Design a protein around this ligand. Sequence first.
Ligand SMILES: Nc1nc2c(ncn2[C@@H]2O[C@H](COP(=O)(O)OP(=O)(O)NP(=O)(O)O)[C@@H](O)[C@H]2O)c(=O)[nH]1
Ligand SMILES: [Mg+2]
Length: 161
Amino acid sequence: MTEYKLVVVGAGGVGKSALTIQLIQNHFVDEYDRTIEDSYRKQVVIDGETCLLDILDTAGRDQYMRTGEGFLCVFAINNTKSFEDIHHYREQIKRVKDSEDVPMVLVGNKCDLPSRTVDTKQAQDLARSYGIPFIETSAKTRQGVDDAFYTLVREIRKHKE
Ligand SMILES: Nc1nc2c(ncn2[C@@H]2O[C@H](COP(=O)(O)OP(=O)(O)NP(=O)(O)O)[C@@H](O)[C@H]2O)c(=O)[nH]1
Ligand SMILES: [Mg+2]
């Protein structure tokens, strides 16, 4: 069996824990519990490949940062600053990995909310510059939660080629 080490990064409160908890335990946590360094493991079938997902839910670990094979760079569509911080998280990932091509996926969370300040056009333009997919998600309605994590694994498969 193949293991995939995934790291979820992003500014505080964008929904990193809610996205991971939806993927692992299939429910939406409505309360805001401040995360330190939560880890998770889960057996799933992705495109027919049985694989283990080792997921670190970082706070807004250098071990997971060095061992991480793919990175979910998450922002909230109602949080302009979190979208701006994406550049800083990507630079740190490229720094600790010393690679200009690191498997990443850009996630715009909280797309169920009507208080948007980051347009879909902005995020797709940013993702186009990075050469990474962009997924709109809602941990509340579970929209795009599977697609976000599964697309990251496909990006890892493409990188391992
Ligand atoms: N409406 C809505 N609320 C969401 C969504 N995702 C998370 N939230 C809410 O936003 C708050 C923060 O979510 P959380 O998962 O804790 O964010 P975080 O990125 O893990 N925070 P931290 O970096 O401090 O650990 C919670 O109240 C949660 O219910 C979403 O898709 N839609
Ligand atoms: Mg958290």
